Each structure stands twice: as C-alpha cells, then as structure tokens.
Structure 1
Amino acid sequence: TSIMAVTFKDGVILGADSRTTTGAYIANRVTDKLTRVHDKIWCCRSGSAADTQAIADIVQYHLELYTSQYGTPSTETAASVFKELCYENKDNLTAGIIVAGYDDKNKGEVYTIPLGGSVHKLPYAIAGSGSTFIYGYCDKNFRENMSKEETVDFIKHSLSQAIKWDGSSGGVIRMVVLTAAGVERLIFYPDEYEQL
C-alpha cells in the first residue's frame, strides 16, 4: 500500500492505492483509504488498518470540537494532536499517517508522521512500501508550484512504477484534490495509468 501527497500551485493533491491485503491474498481491492477527518484536512493511511483507524477516529472527534470551541484547526495544530497519540503508542501500535491539508491561506502543506511520531513539514512526501522505487524518480521531477493538469499526471506515473515492482501496491488510484474550490474526488483505473 503505497500512498503519497504532492503540492501544486493551487494547493495539494493526495493520491493513494486502494488495496488492503492479507498476506499475498488481496483481501479487498476497493477499500477506502483517503479518509475525512475534517473538511480540508484529509489523510493517507499505511500500516495496520486497525491501529491507524483507532488514532484517526479519536482525532476526528477532536477536530470537530477544536473547530467549534477554539476556531479552525491548523494543519500544524492538527498534526500535533495526531503526533501525541503516535508518540505514546509508538511501540504499542505501528501507524504511519500522512496528514495533509490545504489552507486557502497557506496553500498545500504536507506533514508526515512516522511510526515513532513527529511533525515534519515537507514540500511533498511518499510512504508505504513502494515509496522506495520512486524516491529517485520523484526527486528529479520535482517542479515548483506545478500546473494542476501536470500534477495529476505526475502522481499517476510515480505510482504506476510502484505497482509493477510491488504487488501490495495496486488498485485504483483515488485522489482528492484539495484546492480553494473544495474537495474533488478523482478516480483512475489501471486501464488509464498502467500503460503510461
């Protein structure tokens, strides 16, 4: 299960492979992974689906209550809440959550929280098991403040490699484009992207 989030001019586009695997068996290939914990802060999930869910459901309650009593949650602020649970449950749970958000004020922002728990703000981020293959690809093809049309194209391509060399990665690349416009879901099948 490779996952990524990549900044562009108008914001951030999250993409993700949709499989949930038990062993070499594909347990489910239409599983949902780009999961709404708040309106324009959405997150990519890797690791044990169970562990991460537990974290994500606790935080989702926090951010609603945060917004009403203490006004809008920042991406940085929200990453902090996630970071506390991760840090204390570093041994107990293995959870790798890319929490990514779009503020109209601060455009696309990416925070990666690794298994040990820490807020690390980065331009763009790659996680899951396929990240490695496309570490070298992605670095070379990093453009700043990309055109929207390209950004979609770029993610499709990166993940396309991942799926050929690692069987876990696979299924539909679902995306949520978080820009000033709102939340737009896109869906791309291997028929469209695998050839390219």
Structure 2
Amino acid sequence: TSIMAVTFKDGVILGADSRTTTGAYIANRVTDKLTRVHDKIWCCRSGSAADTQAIADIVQYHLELYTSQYGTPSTETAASVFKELCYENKDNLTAGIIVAGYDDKNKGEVYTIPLGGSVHKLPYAIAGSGSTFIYGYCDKNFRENMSKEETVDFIKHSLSQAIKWDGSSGGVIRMVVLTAAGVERLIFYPDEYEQL
C-alpha cells in the first residue's frame, strides 16, 4: 500500500494506490483505500483491511452522531476519534491511518496515526509499505501552498515511484480533492503514471 495526504493552498488532497495482496496474490487490484468518514473529512487506510474498515465505520458512526448533536466536527476531532480507537486497542489492531479534512476556518489539515496510536499533525503525510521508497523524493519535492495542479502532480509522481518499487502497491492511483468548492474524485491509470 502507498498512501498520502498533502495540504495545499485551496485545501487538501488524499492519494492512494489500489492494490490489496494476500501474500504474492493480488486479491483486489481496484481497491478504494480512500474512505469517507464525513462530508469533507476522509482517511487513507493502511494495515489490516479488516481493522481499518472496522475503525473507519466506527469513526463514521461517531462523527454522524457528533453532527446530529453539535454540528460539523473539525478535522482535529475526527483525528482524535481515530486516535482513541487505535491507541486504546493498539494490542489488537494493525492500522496506519492518515486523516485529512477541509474546514473553512482551518482550511486543509493532515493528521497521521501510525501503528502506536500517536497523532501527528503535518503539512503532508505518507504511509504504507510503499512509502519507504519515496521519503527522499517527497522531502525534496514538497512545497507549502502549492496549486491544485502542482499537488496532483506531486502525489501522482510520488505514488508512481512508490508503486514502481513496492510489489505490495500497484494498480490505479486514486485521489480525493477537498476544497471549499466541494469533493472531487480523480483516477490515474498505469499507462499515464508509469511513463512519468
């Protein structure tokens, strides 16, 4: 798995590969690893698919119930609910989750929750098995307040490399753009990103 969330001028973009493997067998080659917990709060999932799915569903429930009572939750609040589940159940979970969301007040925000259950607020975050191969690349090429087209290219190039080197990653590059304008889903096929 190769996943990332990147803040930019107009908000934040989440990005992910689409490969799910059982050992060397690709069980699902068109996986959707970008999952929606609220209108403009999404997460990237890595680790146990059963665990990250179970967590994401519980978070969606908590934020739905939060919204019923207290209105739209902040991205920080969503990250705190993810953290609470991951940290308190650390012994029984294998989940590495990036949380990304757009407020109008705070704009784009990215929170990463690695295996421990710790929370880290970052300008961008990378995660999953394929992330190791792009720490060098991403650190050298990331700038703050990029344009939408620059951030789409930054994620596309980064995950392209993650996919190239990691066997556990592959398939299409899905992205989810979060801005004031709304929610846009993007997809990029092998024939496009491999020739970069």
Shift of 1:111: 0.3
Q: Deviations over 1:17-70 (max 9, x none)?
A: 011111111001012111111100001000010011111111111101101102
CA–CA separation in structure 1 for the residues paired with 2:81 and 2:150 = 33
CA–CA separation in structure 2 for the residues paired with 1:165 and 1:143 = 24
CA–CA separation in structure 1 for the residues paired with 2:127 and 2:91 = 19
CA–CA separation in structure 1 for the residues paired with 2:57 and 2:18 = 19
Shift of 1:101: 0.6
The unaligned stretches of length 5 or more in structure 1 are none
Question: For the Cα contact (< 8 Å) 2:99–2:112, is it kept in 1?
Answer: yes
Residue 195 of structure 2: SS of its match in structure 1? coil
CA–CA separation in structure 2 for the residues paired with 1:166 and 1:113 = 21
Residue 110 of structure 1: SS of its match in structure 2? strand
Shift of 1:84: 1.0
Shift of 1:16: 0.3
Shift of 1:102: 1.1
Shift of 1:138: 0.8
CA–CA separation in structure 1 for the residues paired with 2:153 and 2:67 = 34
Q: Deviations over 1:150-196 (max 9, x none)?
A: 11111110111111211111111011000111110011001111110
Residue 130 of structure 1: SS of its match in structure 2? helix
Structure 1 residue ranges (4+ consecutive) displaced by more than 4 angstroms after TM superposition: none
CA–CA separation in structure 1 for the residues paired with 2:81 and 2:193 = 36
Question: For the Cα contact (< 8 Å) 2:142–2:154, is it kept in 1?
Answer: no
TM-score normalised by L of structure 2: 0.97
Residue 9 of structure 1: SS of its match in structure 2? coil
The unaligned stretches of length 5 or more in structure 2 are none
Equivalent residue, structure 2, for 1:33? 33
Shift of 1:142: 1.6
CA–CA separation in structure 2 for the residues paired with 1:194 and 1:168 = 16
CA–CA separation in structure 2 for the residues paired with 1:142 and 1:57 = 32
Residue 104 of structure 1: SS of its match in structure 2? coil
Question: For the Cα contact (< 8 Å) 2:123–2:144, is it kept in 1?
Answer: no
Equivalent residue, structure 1, for 2:126? 126
Q: Provide the identity percentage.
A: 100
Shift of 1:140: 1.1
